[PDB]
Design a binder for this molecule. Structure first.
Ligand SMILES: Cc1cc(C#N)cc(C)c1Oc1nc(Nc2ccc(C#N)cc2)nc(N)c1Br
Ligand SMILES: [Cl-]
Lengths: 552, 401
């Protein structure tokens, strides 16, 4: 009950000194509770009495327990914590089931009084001094300091885990075939041993722990498969998310839909092809949490599609280190990608989705690559190696894009899989100017305070046209002029522009965009049989440009 | 004896997140790090050290080497390695016929690190799937990769080299991070012989490639020469000149965009004229030479931009203020990011020799993509700073070779 482990040196931030907070008066039932609590704690070593020598103090109080008739000592370390050094962050993250190896038998051991079982640095104890107030604060109080890690202090979580990891180390180093995961108070222990020899391995651990101050309840009350853990349900050789119930409701609040999305997003770790696009579009905008959002049709069918998928239970599988991981990706509603990761087709270790726009304008080949990149980082975290990919894109499609694009890129070993809808390029711009195709010199231009714009073009075939656009930007006009030239020309056409901006957009070959204009321009690009786009310096007197430039 | 090391006032130590590592590299890392700690170069640390710097493994050659990214710590010790002492940069290193680079990082494992500084060198070896807590060490000795180490070892290095310098006055030896740069104008065989000679001095104090910088010439912005000229070709021509104009004083496009009149078809072929053909030649003269008016400013950061040219060709510029090109170059010849990575290392290396500092790179690649992969090909012991950007499609074009 107080570990013989060596303490962690602690100290307060460099400038600062210990807290000196005034204790307020408490009611008399509260003072009574404090005295008996602290008398129990003192007899156990957790705290010990100090003289008024000690300059420092921190507020205590007490609350009634769980509607029951007990009290709990609360200590307010606000000021101590504000004055305490920073510690190494505890966990960088928590393991994913898909990464867990399979075990015959598993047992959860719970460390009793975890914090009060770890000694606190002798030199730092004084700063934890608190005082139990006398009745009406008439007489001086009872003063204590901590000898162990206090509940609510800043360093307790970090010092406990480290303490538990030093103590755990020998047992780990001596039992490499048995596996232990530590999280806060609990210890989760797994072996491929048979229920008899495993429970014996438990007892050695328990008795090792006890040799070090740490008590754990025993072999009479230890639960059974499946185990609930971090929102998952864990079985000896399969896993799944905890049971997910989607409500039957005629009216959905902003709040209901948020919860509904979170649960779907959670289910999508192992339930293939969950979609939340239509439900998420409902959240767009500003609305109270209590307000009701009429689901749309698309959203009503999504919820339907999801509720089917969730009907039949699905499980995930655990990781065999001796086999490759394969990852498969599919296209869904525009911007939505789903993926599965398995080692034996098609027993998934896990699944998921990717739906992110990078920039305003992407095409499918860019999105797929981003998804490959996201999935690769995830595999390294979970499995420590990268997956072999299967992708709905022809090697030739990908190869044409990689070179075409000015950005560098690279995806690991992958092969084609014919899972429509296939990702492709929907048009290509000409590398060279076109003979016998009309040359449109375009140009848009706004007025900075008016927001009045004029877009248009001049042609080498002497054709020309200008229009007036209202409340648009100099950006949008240069783009409207491109659109203009696409509309009024034939299936082939050379377009000359001054907009580096517009050039940038189209040259990257978008097939999606937030912009209505850009999606318009795209529709046209598809229908054309040859487009060459070229850029020229603004107002540098370039033949064709000046003409359509004055005329706007 | 430990030279006391102070951070820049008002800054705390680094707290950088450890990137996820592959199983293969983690394992190499434990091997390496258990050996380093037996030897007492590093010690395990408690939770009371809040600091962290990233660690990973590279191939220096089948054998794992460990690489610590002190880019952040370096920024926070800066004042120290840059202006208390701090190694001066030989102006003639870049003029030598031959300069050899040697790894002397092993030397720092000898010198103790100021105890009140150790805690800032903390790093973490992550575990796969977060199943066990990272294992955590700090340094007890001058770490490789921290710019403080050569500054502190400096004093011992000139001692180690004095006889050899005394005996070859005309050999230049510049230290940067964990490398020694040794240059001369000897014939390559005689150079290599002096290198081995130098290796023997080093060898008595603890210790285990070839540049020819005087053959580094600039990559001009090039103007095509054509049989025939189209409107389209001339517009491209007027563009490129117009850009080079924002940099190179003297560039004239007047006589040229003369030819471009009215509203011609892009494919129409337009006659070469004298004064144009002269303007094109005279412009070539200029683009050949250094940029009149641009100088290195020792107090400003170096920037390096790279553009993917396709077909294994990459172009680059180094500047402190945009367009004022201090230098311009190319790199040539599989894998897009492997190449980028080679290019960055080449560019960094030239930069170290010329100015004695590393540029911050503007990298034409997806953050996540680069972050995932670069360690797969990195072979330097330093790491430059970098951002990620999308090449303006025109810039790519104007520096096309
Ligand atoms: C032993 C254990 C139990 C629970 C809990 N709860 C949660 C975790 C994170 C556990 O640690 C590990 N478990 C497994 N596999 C595993 C297999 C079957 C079951 C079951 N049933 C649970 C875990 N592999 C690891 N590498 C680690 Br480390
Ligand atoms: Cl200079």
């Amino acid at each position: 009950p107080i570990s013989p482990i060596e303490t962690v040196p602690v100290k307060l931030k460099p400038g600062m000194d210990g807290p000196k907070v005034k204790q307020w008066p408490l009611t008399e039932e509260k003072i009574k509770a404090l005295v008996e609590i602290c008398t129990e704690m003192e007899k156990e070593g957790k705290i010990s009495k100090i003289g008024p020598e000690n300059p420092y103090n921190t507020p205590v109080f007490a609350i009634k327990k769980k509607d029951s008739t007990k009290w709990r000592k609360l200590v307010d370390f606000r000021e101590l914590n504000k004055r305490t050094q920073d510690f190494w962050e505890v966990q960088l993250g928590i393991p994913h089931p898909a990464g867990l190896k399979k075990n015959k038998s598993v047992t959860v051991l719970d460390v009793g009084d975890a914090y009060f079982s770890v000694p606190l640095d002798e030199d730092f104890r004084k700063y934890t001094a608190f005082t139990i107030p006398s009745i009406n604060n008439e007489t001086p109080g009872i003063r204590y300091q901590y000898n162990v890690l206090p509940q609510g202090w800043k360093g307790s979580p970090a010092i406990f885990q480290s303490s538990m990891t030093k103590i755990l180390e020998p047992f780990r180093k001596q039992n490499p075939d048995i596996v232990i995961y530590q999280y806060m108070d609990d210890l989760y222990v797994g072996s491929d041993l048979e229920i008899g020899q495993h429970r014996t391995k438990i007892e050695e651990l328990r008795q090792h722990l006890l040799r070090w101050g740490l008590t754990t309840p025993d072999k009479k009350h230890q639960k059974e498969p499946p185990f609930l853990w971090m929102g998952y349900e864990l079985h000896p050789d399969k896993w799944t998310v905890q049971p997910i119930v989607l409500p039957e409701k005629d009216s959905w609040t902003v709040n209901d839909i948020q919860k509904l999305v979170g649960k779907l997003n959670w289910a999508s770790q192992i339930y293939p092809g969950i979609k939340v696009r239509q439900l998420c579009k409902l959240l767009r905008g500003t609305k109270a949490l209590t307000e009701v959002i009429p689901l749309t049709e698309e959203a009503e069918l999504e919820l339907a599609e999801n509720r089917e998928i969730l009907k039949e239970p699905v499980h995930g599988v655990y990781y065999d280190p001796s086999k490759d991981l394969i990852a498969e990706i599919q296209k869904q509603g525009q911007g939505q990608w789903t993926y599965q990761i398995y080692q034996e087709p098609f027993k998934n270790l896990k699944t998921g989705k990717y739906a992110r726009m990078r920039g305003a304008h992407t095409n499918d080949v860019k999105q797929l690559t981003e998804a490959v990149q996201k999935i690769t980082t995830e595999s390294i975290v979970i499995w420590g190696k990268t997956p072999k990919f299967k992708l709905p894109i022809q090697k030739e499609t990908w190869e044409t894009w990689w070179t075409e694009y000015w950005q560098a890129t690279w995806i690991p070993e992958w092969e084609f899989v014919n899972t429509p809808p296939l990702v492709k390029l929907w048009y290509q711009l000409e590398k060279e100017p076109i003979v016998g195709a009309e040359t449109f010199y375009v140009d848009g231009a706004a007025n900075r305070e008016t927001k009045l714009g004029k877009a248009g073009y001049v042609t080498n075939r002497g054709r020309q046209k200008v229009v007036t656009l209202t409340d648009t930007t100099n950006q949008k006009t240069e783009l409207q002029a491109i659109y203009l030239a696409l509309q009024d020309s034939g299936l082939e056409v050379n377009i000359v522009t001054d907009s580096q901006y517009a050039l940038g957009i189209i040259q990257a070959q978008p097939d999606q965009s937030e912009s209505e204009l850009v999606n318009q321009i795209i529709e046209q690009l598809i229908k054309k049989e040859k487009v060459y786009l070229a850029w020229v310096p603004a107002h540098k007197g370039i033949g064709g440009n000046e003409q359509v430039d004055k005329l706007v | 004896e430990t030279v006391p090391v102070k951070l820049k006032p008002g800054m705390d130590g680094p707290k950088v997140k450890q990137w996820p590592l592959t199983e293969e590299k983690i394992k190499a890392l434990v091997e390496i790090c258990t050996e380093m700690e037996k030897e007492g170069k590093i010690s395990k640390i408690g939770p009371e050290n809040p600091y962290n710097t990233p660690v990973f493994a590279i191939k220096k050659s089948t054998k794992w080497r460990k690489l610590v990214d002190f880019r952040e710590l370096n920024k926070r010790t800066q004042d120290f390695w840059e202006v208390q002492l701090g190694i001066p940069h030989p102006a003639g290193l870049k003029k030598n016929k031959s300069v050899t680079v040697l790894d002397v990082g092993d030397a720092y494992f000898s010198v103790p690190l100021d105890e009140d500084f150790r805690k800032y060198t903390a790093f973490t070896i992550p575990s796969i799937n977060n199943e066990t807590p990272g294992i955590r060490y700090q340094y007890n000795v001058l770490p490789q990769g921290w710019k403080g180490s050569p500054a502190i070892f400096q004093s011992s290095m000139t001692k180690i080299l004095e006889p050899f310098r005394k005996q070859n006055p005309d050999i230049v030896i510049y230290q940067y991070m964990d490398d020694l740069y040794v240059g001369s104008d000897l014939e390559i065989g005689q150079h290599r012989t002096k290198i081995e000679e130098l290796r023997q001095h080093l060898l008595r104090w603890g210790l285990t490639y070839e540049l020819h910088p005087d053959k580094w010439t600039v990559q001009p912005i090039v103007l095509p020469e054509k049989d025939s000229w189209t409107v389209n070709d001339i517009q491209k021509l007027v563009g490129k000149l117009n850009w080079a104009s924002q940099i190179y004083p003297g560039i004239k496009v007047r006589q040229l965009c003369k030819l471009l009149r009215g509203t011609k078809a892009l494919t129409e072929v337009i006659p070469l004229t004298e004064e144009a053909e002269l303007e094109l030649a005279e412009n070539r003269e200029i683009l050949k030479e250094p940029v009149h008016g641009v100088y290195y400013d020792p107090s400003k950061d170096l920037i390096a931009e790279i553009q993917k040219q396709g077909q294994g060709q990459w172009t680059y510029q180094i500047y402190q203020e945009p367009f004022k090109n201090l230098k311009t170059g190319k790199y040539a010849r599989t894998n897009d990011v492997k190449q980028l990575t080679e290019a960055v290392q080449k560019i960094t290396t030239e930069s170290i020799v010329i100015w004695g500092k590393t540029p911050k790179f503007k990298l034409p690649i997806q953050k996540e993509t680069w972050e995932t992969w670069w360690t797969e090909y990195w072979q330097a012991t330093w790491i430059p700073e970098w951002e990620f950007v999308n090449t303006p499609p025109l810039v790519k074009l104007w520096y096309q070779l």
